Amino acid sequence: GTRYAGKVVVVTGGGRGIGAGIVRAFVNSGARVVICDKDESGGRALEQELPGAVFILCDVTQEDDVKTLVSETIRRFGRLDCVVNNAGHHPPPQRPEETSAQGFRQLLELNLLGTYTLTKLALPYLRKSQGNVINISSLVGAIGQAQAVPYVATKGAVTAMTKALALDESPYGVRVNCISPGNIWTPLWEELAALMPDPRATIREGMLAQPLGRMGQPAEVGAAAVFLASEANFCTGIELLVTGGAELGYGCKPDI
Amino acid sequence: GTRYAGKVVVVTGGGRGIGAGIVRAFVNSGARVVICDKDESGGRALEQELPGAVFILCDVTQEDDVKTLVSETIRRFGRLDCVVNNAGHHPPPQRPEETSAQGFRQLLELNLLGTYTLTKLALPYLRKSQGNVINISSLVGAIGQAQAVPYVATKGAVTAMTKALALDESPYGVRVNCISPGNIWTPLWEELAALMPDPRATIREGMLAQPLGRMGQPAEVGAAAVFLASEANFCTGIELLVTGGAELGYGCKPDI
Amino acid sequence: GTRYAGKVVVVTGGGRGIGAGIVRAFVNSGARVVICDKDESGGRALEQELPGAVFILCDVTQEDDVKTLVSETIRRFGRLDCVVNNAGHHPPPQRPEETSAQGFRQLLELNLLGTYTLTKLALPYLRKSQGNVINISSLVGAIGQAQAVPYVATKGAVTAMTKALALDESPYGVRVNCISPGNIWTPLWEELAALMPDPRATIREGMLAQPLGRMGQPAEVGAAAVFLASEANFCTGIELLVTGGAELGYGCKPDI
Amino acid sequence: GTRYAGKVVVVTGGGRGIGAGIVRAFVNSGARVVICDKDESGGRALEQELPGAVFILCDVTQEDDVKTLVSETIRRFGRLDCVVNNAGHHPPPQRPEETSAQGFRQLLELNLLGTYTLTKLALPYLRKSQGNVINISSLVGAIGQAQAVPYVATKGAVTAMTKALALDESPYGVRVNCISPGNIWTPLWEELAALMPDPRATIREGMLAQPLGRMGQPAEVGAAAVFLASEANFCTGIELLVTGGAELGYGCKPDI
């Protein structure tokens, strides 16, 4: 309740899924939180539910939306300590030949350039507060994923960008880290599974992809984010895996 | 002279630097090589110099240029075995606040989407030949670099994309690998150093950034590419470091 | 004060340095802590200082010492939830030709097999409590270090062993993670620096090896350990870097 | 036939499996090769088969055997250019509680200290020749393996040691690299599979653990070793994966 008292946090895509779990974790640590989302439904209800969280409608791909997000955060709360770049999307499975450069550009706009834009606009205020940036990347940026060339590329970019920016902002006391979740049970996971011939089988495979035998929860990503913000003062440029061990060992993926 | 005899290779940005070193290595291994470049000067001279190499003017950011590159390769040589996605650029040092989303998009077009586009157009022919893709990424995609947020992000994306595509194309016998060079002495390195207050000091630092005490050569990247194409039949999705050890150990980058 | 209330933690080498910082962090989170050390001086004073910590003399290289450590922990506190394998040593700088197989074996006994032995003896009790293992490895296991072949090898082994054991113990709900610190200001760091021709210069270099410009603190490693024990329920087999960014970018470590 | 002409190579455990594939690759590149093995059967036959290879009986865990191996290589061939530390063993599957510290020590003697000992005794001659070291580690040192805590630990140590030694020997022009194979079809693989309830099923799983759908061959590891020795002049401290992509993506290894 006090680990991050008196601090101000912006969470993009905070209306549902991982983002909402990160919102709740920061509120529970004593922070005031600005929920940014392009859709009103979840975020507006979360603002009613949580004292200390407020909702601001903002599409992170629209630069003037993000400019307003930052200026309204400062106007209303007087400081900015942490930005969590969580907004992002996973398209359905697509074979390489079914992808397009246009679709690839549009996904880069959300998953990469939206993170870039908010970070850039927030950094002057984070420097004043010796605050920090937390990017939500993905395990599959590191190890790959099938039928997801554009998504994997965007997350490779986020993880790498995190390290570059950590180098540049270290002289100013601003840390820049990322979390790479694996399979987290969210509305996006549920939506993608419902597209499959056997959704139930897809979900069962997703649970057994982890040595721990289950998918992760938004609250567990949220706890990792609170750690990075509030207690990881000698961490910068790290990639914090929240994956249940999916990257470990051999699995189903004589010598001719 | 025979390790890759009878094979056909496309090298983008093959007119100078690393690309020209890769062109020479493949010619020396017995392959026929198509030199793709947006500038004529170097590539046209290389075509005159090397029996077995020919030059095709092609800007990899222009989709119809790349369509023509592939169709002309097939028309002239009847097969395609390896594409080397080397074309790319490093902008001058830029502090994060000096970058723009527009500049970032333009660098993504070259360093990432140009690699994507040629790979996509070539894959039908690589499937027929059980050929392979070699992407030239960078060490700094893995470890970061100062004053280079956009460049680092693009190379993070290339390395990650390499792994995704290796997964998707493995059922068809097409391997997809990347090389991550460190400091290689090229015209781009020389151009960037000439921008500095003390170019000579910049070059000296660049040499001592490697435990081996020197920068790398285009020929050394070229040898790694020939290995991946011709002898690495159980390698796919790997990142082959050609860096002189720059990523090893501690260097210049009490507890408060 | 309550994040790990009611839990019982063993910290090896807890008498000073990183180990004592981990002891304090767990006490501050509400846990009861058993301080294991081969030397009495620091650990006995820490037991007097901290309600909720007690000292047990134990050399982790002596199997019967470790057997007694575990049985006394259970006898006195009735459960065991977390073991932190921190005991370890860094020999002075040694050129490869100045090392011996005998010295290498002895360092393996402490840095690797002592971690192995306590983990093995504790696992039956950790299974009952759904507890967890935290190994203190090092950044240099991942990236190397000069004049330290035996030390680097031992830490490579610890990090790898962490992943293997995480796989084996995941069906039982026992997580196994490691922390890889970089330069942490401790008595061992101070002792090694005092061996150098210019200790002050050695310490200054050690501070500037991190983008953050300082060495880390035992308290910061301790906070990472409390996170892994108490809040990282979907993390297993991870390597949590606490290094101030030392692994990022180029530093001091034309093409002939 | 000429890539490594006039050079002298020692391959430990060269009598069968990966080691014999590395022997053949170097002979085919023009090198003279000393086959070291503790068993005579395979290595003696290979010496009869291959002009340019000779067999020396040597147990790499016995220091005087290794001293004699080096002195006999120099006495007979007058130089030493490359040592390939391939000798090693994988014990049968063992649950953590079924392992012993004694068994762990014995495996460290072979997989780690035997590599250390030959490297140390060879380095004076490698410095004279500007030669290189190639260690055969394993993919599972990086990602873990089930029921193999001691084996995984030894390979974690080898990979890490490779980087440390590359740092120390770089001022002298001696490169130190490792190869991390995945599933390679060898007599050891066949022996381990025959221990299983369903050997055929074990072998089928082993083939499908790779995106490429097969196990690797000793010849493919051998080609990687020849590359590292003869053409990778700007590579030191690297880990060259020869795994068929087993480390990529998700596999078989809702949120509670």
Ligand SMILES: NC(=O)c1ccc[n+]([C@@H]2O[C@H](COP(=O)([O-])OP(=O)(O)OC[C@H]3O[C@@H](n4cnc5c(N)ncnc54)[C@H](O)[C@@H]3O)[C@@H](O)[C@H]2O)c1
């Ligand atoms: N769910 C997983 O298993 C998983 C795994 C790894 C990484 N991730 C990453 O975590 C993040 C969140 O994923 P999730 O599963 O919670 O997804 P989700 O779809 O359930 O929630 C994403 C939220 O972001 C919002 N959003 C989308 N586009 C936006 C935009 N342009 N501007 C503002 N808000 C926008 C959505 O409206 C939604 O509220 C994404 O970056 C995703 O790539 C998810």
Ligand SMILES: NC(=O)c1ccc[n+]([C@@H]2O[C@H](COP(=O)([O-])OP(=O)(O)OC[C@H]3O[C@@H](n4cnc5c(N)ncnc54)[C@H](O)[C@@H]3O)[C@@H](O)[C@H]2O)c1
């Ligand atoms: N030089 C290094 O130290 C270094 C290190 C790591 C990675 N790399 C990468 O290696 C690649 C080559 O770098 P370099 O140093 O040889 O650079 P360079 O500038 O010397 O050569 C690049 C070549 O690509 C061509 N090119 C540029 N844009 C193109 C386009 N749109 N279409 C076609 N051709 C185009 C240029 O005309 C030039 O001939 C790049 O991807 C770079 O990021 C270089």
Ligand SMILES: NC(=O)c1ccc[n+]([C@@H]2O[C@H](COP(=O)([O-])OP(=O)(O)OC[C@H]3O[C@@H](n4cnc5c(N)ncnc54)[C@H](O)[C@@H]3O)[C@@H](O)[C@H]2O)c1
């Ligand atoms: N200090 C750093 O920069 C640094 C960096 C990376 C990793 N580490 C690791 O962190 C751990 C602690 O390092 P530190 O700097 O705090 O060292 P330290 O020497 O200051 O403290 C180590 C403690 O362990 C105890 N110990 C040593 N051998 C023991 C044994 N056989 N049985 C029981 N206790 C034993 C010592 O008596 C001492 O109290 C070690 O594993 C070290 O490798 C340290």
Ligand SMILES: NC(=O)c1ccc[n+]([C@@H]2O[C@H](COP(=O)([O-])OP(=O)(O)OC[C@H]3O[C@@H](n4cnc5c(N)ncnc54)[C@H](O)[C@@H]3O)[C@@H](O)[C@H]2O)c1
């Ligand atoms: N086969 C795989 O899938 C695989 C995968 C990754 C790594 N590796 C590694 O590759 C290496 C070779 O494995 P392999 O499958 O070819 O094994 P193998 O058992 O088929 O061959 C190993 C050879 O080493 C010899 N040897 C064993 N102990 C020795 C000693 N003390 N001194 C000298 N020679 C000794 C054996 O007699 C044998 O000829 C080992 O280091 C192993 O860990 C193998």
Ligand SMILES: C=C(c1ccc(F)c(O)c1)c1cccc(-c2cccc(O)c2F)n1
């Ligand atoms: C949201 C998904 C996801 C899963 C793991 C990650 F690491 C990540 O970043 C996102 C998800 C959920 C179900 C299916 C898929 C999916 C989509 C396209 C191609 C695939 O191979 C998938 F598994 N992703």
Ligand SMILES: C=C(c1ccc(F)c(O)c1)c1cccc(-c2cccc(O)c2F)n1
């Ligand atoms: C071309 C350069 C380069 C160097 C190393 C790499 F890994 C890479 O991919 C590219 C280069 C050469 C000189 C200077 C710089 C440079 C540019 C901007 C920011 C920096 O920190 C730089 F070192 N890059």
Ligand SMILES: C=C(c1ccc(F)c(O)c1)c1cccc(-c2cccc(O)c2F)n1
């Ligand atoms: C205790 C030291 C240390 C530093 C960094 C690490 F990641 C680590 O695990 C331990 C330390 C402190 C001062 C000097 C040295 C040292 C010792 C031998 C060889 C070297 O290159 C060193 F830097 N280590």
Ligand SMILES: C=C(c1ccc(F)c(O)c1)c1cccc(-c2cccc(O)c2F)n1
């Ligand atoms: C020789 C085996 C092996 C397989 C992959 C590697 F990366 C490696 O270094 C060695 C092998 C072959 C069959 C079975 C096993 C095995 C043994 C014990 C535990 C396991 O989980 C295994 F797969 N290893």
Ligand SMILES: OC[C@H]1O[C@@H](O)[C@H](O)[C@@H](O)[C@@H]1O
């Ligand atoms: O829809 C899948 C899951 O999404 C998560 O974000 C919610 O917290 C869960 O209540 C829900 O079951």
Ligand SMILES: OC[C@H]1O[C@@H](O)[C@H](O)[C@@H](O)[C@@H]1O
């Ligand atoms: O311009 C720097 C270097 O670029 C390389 O591509 C050329 O091969 C060298 O001859 C030249 O010195």
Ligand SMILES: OC[C@H]1O[C@@H](O)[C@H](O)[C@@H](O)[C@@H]1O
């Ligand atoms: O000796 C170096 C440092 O060691 C740490 O363990 C102590 O907490 C510090 O007080 C001390 O300055």
Ligand SMILES: OC[C@H]1O[C@@H](O)[C@H](O)[C@@H](O)[C@@H]1O
């Ligand atoms: O025994 C398994 C395999 O081992 C390899 O070392 C041999 O080259 C193969 O001929 C054999 O099939």
Ligand code: NA
């Ligand atoms: Na509210």
Ligand code: NA
């Ligand atoms: Na020509």
Ligand code: NA
């Ligand atoms: Na006490």
Ligand code: NA
């Ligand atoms: Na012979």
